[PDB]
Design an enzyme around this catalytic site. Sequence first.
Site, PDB file in Angstrom:
ATOM      1  N   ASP A 160      22.484 -24.023 -53.984  1.00 30.09           N
ATOM      2  CA  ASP A 160      21.449 -23.085 -53.563  1.00 30.09           C
ATOM      3  C   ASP A 160      20.119 -23.816 -53.700  1.00 30.09           C
ATOM      4  O   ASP A 160      19.084 -23.349 -53.219  1.00 30.09           O
ATOM      5  CB  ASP A 160      21.430 -21.841 -54.457  1.00 30.09           C
ATOM      6  CG  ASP A 160      20.434 -20.788 -53.977  1.00 30.09           C
ATOM      7  OD1 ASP A 160      20.088 -19.891 -54.776  1.00 30.09           O
ATOM      8  OD2 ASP A 160      20.007 -20.848 -52.800  1.00 30.09           O
TER       9      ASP A 160
ATOM     10  N   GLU B 232      38.720 -15.152 -11.888  1.00 28.71           N
ATOM     11  CA  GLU B 232      38.754 -14.807 -13.295  1.00 28.71           C
ATOM     12  C   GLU B 232      38.330 -13.366 -13.492  1.00 28.71           C
ATOM     13  O   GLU B 232      37.793 -12.742 -12.575  1.00 28.71           O
ATOM     14  CB  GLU B 232      37.854 -15.770 -14.089  1.00 28.71           C
ATOM     15  CG  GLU B 232      36.480 -16.043 -13.472  1.00 28.71           C
ATOM     16  CD  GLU B 232      35.752 -17.216 -14.134  1.00 28.71           C
ATOM     17  OE1 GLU B 232      36.097 -18.377 -13.836  1.00 28.71           O
ATOM     18  OE2 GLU B 232      34.843 -16.978 -14.960  1.00 28.71           O
TER      19      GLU B 232
ATOM     20  N   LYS C 256      36.180 -10.181 -14.937  1.00 29.85           N
ATOM     21  CA  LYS C 256      34.753  -9.975 -15.084  1.00 29.85           C
ATOM     22  C   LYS C 256      34.425  -9.361 -16.435  1.00 29.85           C
ATOM     23  O   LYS C 256      34.427  -8.139 -16.594  1.00 29.85           O
ATOM     24  CB  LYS C 256      34.221  -9.072 -13.985  1.00 29.85           C
ATOM     25  CG  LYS C 256      33.948  -9.816 -12.715  1.00 29.85           C
ATOM     26  CD  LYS C 256      32.996  -9.039 -11.836  1.00 29.85           C
ATOM     27  CE  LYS C 256      31.678  -8.804 -12.534  1.00 29.85           C
ATOM     28  NZ  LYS C 256      30.717  -8.153 -11.602  1.00 29.85           N
TER      29      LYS C 256
ATOM     30  N   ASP D  84      32.815  -7.623 -19.031  1.00 29.63           N
ATOM     31  CA  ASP D  84      31.700  -6.695 -19.112  1.00 29.63           C
ATOM     32  C   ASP D  84      30.967  -6.982 -20.410  1.00 29.63           C
ATOM     33  O   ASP D  84      31.273  -6.401 -21.450  1.00 29.63           O
ATOM     34  CB  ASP D  84      32.198  -5.251 -19.116  1.00 29.63           C
ATOM     35  CG  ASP D  84      31.076  -4.247 -19.323  1.00 29.63           C
ATOM     36  OD1 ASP D  84      30.059  -4.606 -19.946  1.00 29.63           O
ATOM     37  OD2 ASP D  84      31.211  -3.091 -18.873  1.00 29.63           O
TER      38      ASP D  84
ATOM     39  N   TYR E 252      32.153 -19.845 -19.346  1.00 33.68           N
ATOM     40  CA  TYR E 252      32.671 -20.250 -18.040  1.00 33.68           C
ATOM     41  C   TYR E 252      31.803 -21.169 -17.165  1.00 33.68           C
ATOM     42  O   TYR E 252      32.251 -21.597 -16.104  1.00 33.68           O
ATOM     43  CB  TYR E 252      32.932 -18.985 -17.249  1.00 33.68           C
ATOM     44  CG  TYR E 252      31.726 -18.090 -17.269  1.00 33.68           C
ATOM     45  CD1 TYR E 252      31.738 -16.892 -17.966  1.00 33.68           C
ATOM     46  CD2 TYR E 252      30.547 -18.470 -16.632  1.00 33.68           C
ATOM     47  CE1 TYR E 252      30.597 -16.087 -18.032  1.00 33.68           C
ATOM     48  CE2 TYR E 252      29.403 -17.676 -16.692  1.00 33.68           C
ATOM     49  CZ  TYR E 252      29.442 -16.492 -17.395  1.00 33.68           C
ATOM     50  OH  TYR E 252      28.327 -15.713 -17.477  1.00 33.68           O
TER      51      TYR E 252
ATOM     52  N   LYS F 130      34.359  -6.324  -7.270  1.00 36.99           N
ATOM     53  CA  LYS F 130      34.453  -5.266  -8.267  1.00 36.99           C
ATOM     54  C   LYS F 130      35.414  -4.122  -7.985  1.00 36.99           C
ATOM     55  O   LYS F 130      35.579  -3.706  -6.836  1.00 36.99           O
ATOM     56  CB  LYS F 130      33.055  -4.687  -8.527  1.00 36.99           C
ATOM     57  CG  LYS F 130      31.988  -5.737  -8.859  1.00 36.99           C
ATOM     58  CD  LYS F 130      31.136  -5.322 -10.044  1.00 36.99           C
ATOM     59  CE  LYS F 130      30.466  -3.971  -9.816  1.00 36.99           C
ATOM     60  NZ  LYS F 130      29.610  -3.562 -10.969  1.00 36.99           N
TER      61      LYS F 130
ATOM     62  N   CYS G 289      31.101  28.204 -39.522  1.00 37.31           N
ATOM     63  CA  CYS G 289      32.125  27.228 -39.258  1.00 37.31           C
ATOM     64  C   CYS G 289      33.265  28.075 -38.687  1.00 37.31           C
ATOM     65  O   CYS G 289      33.649  29.101 -39.272  1.00 37.31           O
ATOM     66  CB  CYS G 289      32.545  26.568 -40.554  1.00 37.31           C
ATOM     67  SG  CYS G 289      34.033  25.694 -40.384  1.00 37.31           S
TER      68      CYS G 289
ATOM     69  N   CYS H 198      36.716  28.372 -41.163  1.00 33.29           N
ATOM     70  CA  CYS H 198      36.770  28.855 -42.548  1.00 33.29           C
ATOM     71  C   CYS H 198      35.770  29.967 -42.760  1.00 33.29           C
ATOM     72  O   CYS H 198      35.805  30.655 -43.785  1.00 33.29           O
ATOM     73  CB  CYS H 198      36.467  27.725 -43.538  1.00 33.29           C
ATOM     74  SG  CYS H 198      34.738  27.269 -43.631  1.00 33.29           S
TER      75      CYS H 198
ATOM     76  N   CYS I 294      29.970  21.575 -42.315  1.00 33.70           N
ATOM     77  CA  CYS I 294      30.407  22.660 -43.190  1.00 33.70           C
ATOM     78  C   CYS I 294      30.433  22.233 -44.656  1.00 33.70           C
ATOM     79  O   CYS I 294      31.247  21.395 -45.067  1.00 33.70           O
ATOM     80  CB  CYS I 294      31.793  23.135 -42.773  1.00 33.70           C
ATOM     81  SG  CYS I 294      32.424  24.429 -43.836  1.00 33.70           S
TER      82      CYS I 294
ATOM     83  N   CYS J 144      36.954  24.298 -47.050  1.00 34.05           N
ATOM     84  CA  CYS J 144      37.252  24.479 -45.620  1.00 34.05           C
ATOM     85  C   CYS J 144      38.571  23.748 -45.326  1.00 34.05           C
ATOM     86  O   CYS J 144      38.737  22.586 -45.701  1.00 34.05           O
ATOM     87  CB  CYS J 144      36.106  23.905 -44.780  1.00 34.05           C
ATOM     88  SG  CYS J 144      36.558  23.389 -43.126  1.00 34.05           S
TER      89      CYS J 144
HETATM   90 ZN   LIG Z   1      34.710  24.942 -42.716  1.00 31.11          ZN
END
Ligand SMILES: [Zn+2]
Length: 584
Positions: free
Chosen positions: A34, A116, A118, A120, A226, A315, A409, A412, A425, A430
């Site tokens: 360090d 190839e 695509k 995303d 690529y 596409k 809720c 319950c 809740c 519950c």
């Molecule tokens: Zn609840």
Amino acid sequence: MTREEARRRINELRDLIRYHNYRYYVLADPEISDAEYDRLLRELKELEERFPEFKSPDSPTEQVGARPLEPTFRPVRHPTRMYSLDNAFTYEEVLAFEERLERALGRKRPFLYTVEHKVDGLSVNLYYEEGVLVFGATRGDGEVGEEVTQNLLTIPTIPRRLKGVPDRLEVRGEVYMPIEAFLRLNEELEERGEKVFKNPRNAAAGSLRQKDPRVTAKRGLRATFYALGLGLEESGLKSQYELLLWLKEKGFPVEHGYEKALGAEGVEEVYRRFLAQRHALPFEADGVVVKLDDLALWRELGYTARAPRFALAYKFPAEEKETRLLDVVFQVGRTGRVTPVGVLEPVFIEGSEVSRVTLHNESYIEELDIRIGDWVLVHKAGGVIPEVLRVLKERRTGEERPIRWPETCPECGHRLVKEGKVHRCPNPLCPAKRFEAIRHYASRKAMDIEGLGEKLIERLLEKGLVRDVADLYHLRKEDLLGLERMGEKSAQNLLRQIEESKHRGLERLLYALGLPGVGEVLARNLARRFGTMDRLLEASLEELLEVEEVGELTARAILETLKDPAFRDLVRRLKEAGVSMESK
Ligand SMILES: [Zn+2]
């Protein structure tokens, strides 16, 4: 030292220093000292001042210390320009495209291409000198992008030292987040009450655009490469196909799939064999990329204003459809968070008939201003989870109703409570929260009950033997634990844990019953100050604030749970079973 040399060490030093700041504050498995580490961070500053020219707001120096070495999101023009591809959506196009290439020809049309997937994701640029990684920036606008080298180090696949490469190398590829991760990151966000990402590109952007590189490492981020920039010619590469293989051999990760294909027709073959695996990949892919395979013939073919001519992006059909949001119903998760669910007009997206879509949380509904009567454009986030992409506002009849959570809720009857950015809740009992409760209480951090496997808890919960935490101690009847894979070799064993756990002290006990905010530390700091549940149960607002780390917002919360009859009930039943209610 020769001005050239100084650059190199400067390139190298900054690297080793980024590597180890990472090997440290990130991985936690440092190699060097360090201190011997600052023996490099200094020399970096020594050469940076006797060769001022090389100073770069990127250098570790510009913001040093014993803190996590962050990435300066400073704008940076790339050595070469990074372009975007043009989009085709039909086979006519892509025929026309290969036809456009015919303008030149040589006794053909069926042109060898490399096709190839695509990816995303987000385009990233990685500049390397003499092999060493100088910096890595995002695509930005094609010419200037943000510097984010640190974050690119949190991805173990991105290599730092190449070999046998051109003195100047500009390799291009992408950084993305796999659907599992994307979806995981999106789940953790809904709970916190944050707005979730609508897709893997954006979600990858942020996960990389974090000040604290330690964060980028918990996100899934994966990267694939690529293309080349400064370096094509240098490399001696001739075919696109070889490129991807070259790229791999060098240490660059190439994970998106690719293969050869002849002429539009052939391309159109890979296309569909692909479109069928459109959701079979560990990542979202919205099409494929037709790249002329002869790199030599790339130069003659130029780039238009903002696109190449030797390559194209074919596409998949866009899965987007309009429909109306009719009613919205609510559900409650295993944590208590009351989730929102939009009931849309039955519509279609890839044959699957969509009729019920998750809202998310109250933020999403707010951000997108999603009222009721509203018409909405629904898509598939990550191409797997339908969600209202956006509302068609102008078409608003003006009579749409705003989404409001219910007073109570639905599972319950307990009145609801807004604990932060999301409604939930508070009910300790519950039914929607039983599994989480039983488990949290059973964790070693809690009342430590090793026997209660996640499966046994849902088995004991389904078979009715348990309903809440107290019930564990009335399971005494081993006769009960002898019908779910356990005999009495297995029963008696756990039976003593539900016993020994009785003794964990008030501290650990407060942590087990998951009170609003009472963390492992906030719990102990609570037990010490009251000695016993009884006392605490009689705590006052003031008395609670006066505690270390208990803020007014959490104080007034704990104060309401404690008074809740359900909580009282649960506690009593636990005491009356011998669970110690004092500080251990
Ligand atoms: Zn609840």
